[model samples]
Target: MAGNFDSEERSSWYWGRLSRQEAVALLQGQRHGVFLVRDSSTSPGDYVLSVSENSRVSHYIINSSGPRPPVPPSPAQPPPGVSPSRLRIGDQEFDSLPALLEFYKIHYLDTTTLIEPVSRSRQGSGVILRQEEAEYVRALFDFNGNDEEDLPFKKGDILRIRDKPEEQWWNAEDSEGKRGMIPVPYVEKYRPASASVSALIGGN
Candidate 1:
């Protein structure tokens, strides 16, 4: 005879948390699997798990595709040798959000800031250029844009552009004077680090 398991009966088993190793092991066995874990007390959103390899695991946090969070008011103290006037974007020399958005069209670039090391030999380097897309234009602009934000743009606390596409994402922290590609559809009015962002940039 077959045993019956109802929703309530299964709830207790499903609610328990699993360690990373355990989770990874399960993912490695499946053809396609995904899971979500969220800390209700700290943050409302959930972290996603995507598994689709012979035996590999990946993790990502969901984010809204919207205008970037408002730029912090009261300009941050300029780094040594940098002037406040230079930080401002546009014709007015914006020291605030309104000033920056007034003349410039703000769009969220679909790009991921890699906090960990990635090898091109293994992962394959370079942004996937979607022809006739804003990200494609942004990539070109990153290579040759006059605006301060265009060439040396910063997303919230971290600078997003890199010098070369082939450069590993982890190397971004110390790649002097390098800029990389930003995805197109991911670009919104303001939101940075949206789910649409990709870690790849273009180069040899």
Candidate 2:
């Protein structure tokens, strides 16, 4: 079993603390977005792009109605000062991230959906999962797995957990404010492993 969580302390950003009715209300009025799991096919890395709730709902309806829809254009292109080699979901390719997500939803309705857990660390003990791997699993498997005892997390790893199973919407957060809910088992955390002090010092 996992450790206990103090709902009062974690309620600010996590949906897990909410009551069933509260969760449903939050989710009902809450927005929807499309998250991108980058390098899922090659490397283990991913990122989320919050799309408009309306767009997501629309896409869901479109997908549920008929044959798969076409893949939308990529989101905004890589921003300046960012490495071209870095994984990016070109928003420029689409009117918005939601549109892209909708396109994906319709296109891959029959495809597998991966669900990655969130990663965390406290007093040196922590757990981490590869973002890329998580994304791949989410895209291939309908479900994913994670463990808490897996400690000594590297920065940039992502993990998932059932903080609030009864909630209507999923919730998560990082020091950087990346958190939200999508369809069931579609949400995940993204944490890039940090370089060790020794590695930085040695410049290796």
Candidate 3:
């Protein structure tokens, strides 16, 4: 979602392709400035920084495709001309989302600062292969069960669908690389920019 994601390097705070509604739900009941980054639902290739403050969610747009604009020299700053990249929110600019987040974690953006991250939910410790990464889906509701064959995943968790065995359950692999059957109604297909474009080209 944030360019080409390196599974080994992607930040836990960066929720890939999460919807705005889902992001708002996750940030709900959190303290001011508690935040998470997600792919923009409206702007493909861009990111949205959703922050909770004063019982409300504020989203900041990050331009991942543009060049970073020059920032005025200040007490808090980065070395010049090392790596020129684009990621701007408000008046600040950064080459990477992590750098932008790290900066805001200390400094103020508007009235609040990012105090904590809504880390990605993990259920296990297996490395999931991103190759042929297609047919991913997002959990619309929390699914909990003790059945050994059923996958228990939380709301907003993204999973790779393996098979559609029936009308009730679908085989899927979670972020932790755990595989099990999940209820069809609990999750919805997550179409990224590429998939949407292809679908448009072959439209009804």
Candidate 4:
């Protein structure tokens, strides 16, 4: 259909060909003002600016034309004293979509500032938790650690608690004493069947 994949590929927020429904699903449960950009479904040649605001989702058309296009009113305003360089949407202008979002990140966009960029992986499975001091958790799902600080592991691998640094990501040490961060959702409290049965029979 449309040409020029280079620009869309470069921007992490630019989710090309993502439908309105998909965008909404991704932004659901995210904090207000979290947003992402996608190809406009209504207008083939244009892009769509979807945002989560006031516990609701809103969409705006981003005109892709190089020259003049119908200027639709937007809740987002341009930075002070700054003029348009190339791309123009509403009262704001920037060379690229990322630049436009960069401006809005500092300023307001629909009464809320854009705080986070919702990615595809963010909409994945929810985290399961619990247990006492020195708690051990087992990987319920495989997680490949892409970052240097991350601890990669396969499903069913047991890891001991090390630190409570974050909610979604936890610091842990594997059975082999390999310490690193692990995604919360990928693991759950490690409890053997025999131990649970014994607890049930003995009562607490």
Highest-scoring model, TM-score: 3
lDDT string for model 2 (1-204, tens) is 245543212222222322323333343344332222211222233323222233231111111111222234755444345333332243223333223443454443323221211111123244543233322111112222243222222233243332333455433332222333323444334444555233321100
Residue 52 lDDT, candidate 3, scale 0-100:
76
- TM-score of each candidate? 0.19, 0.16, 0.45, 0.43
lDDT (10s digit) by residue, model 4, range 1-204: 234544434334665557777887777656565787777788767677778766666776776544322346756555434333545456666676656777777777656676667665532234545444654688665665576577666666666667767788888765445667775765677763444332211101
Answer with 1 or 3, whichever has the higher TM-score: 3
Best first by lDDT, ranked: 3, 4, 1, 2
Q: Which runs of model 4 end up more than 4 angstroms from their true locations? A: 1-11, 66-85, 122-204
Candidate number that wins on TM-score, 2 or 4? 4
Point out the higher-scoring one by lDDT: 1 or 4.
4
Q: Cα RMSD for candidate 4?
A: 16.8
Candidate 2 segments exceeding 4 Å error: 1-28, 31-43, 55-82, 85-87, 91-204
Task: Sort the candidates on TM-score, descending order.
Answer: 3, 4, 1, 2
Error of 3 at 3 (Å): 22
| Candidate 1, 51-131: lDDT as tens digits | 223345544332222122223574554433433433232123434322222223332112211121111122223366533
Per-residue lDDT tens digits of candidate 3, residues 53-145?
Answer: 677767888876534333445565444444466567777676676678878887877776888776546533457544555457876666555
Residue-level lDDT for 94 in candidate 3? 69
lDDT of each: 0.31, 0.29, 0.66, 0.62
Clashes of each: 17, 27, 0, 0
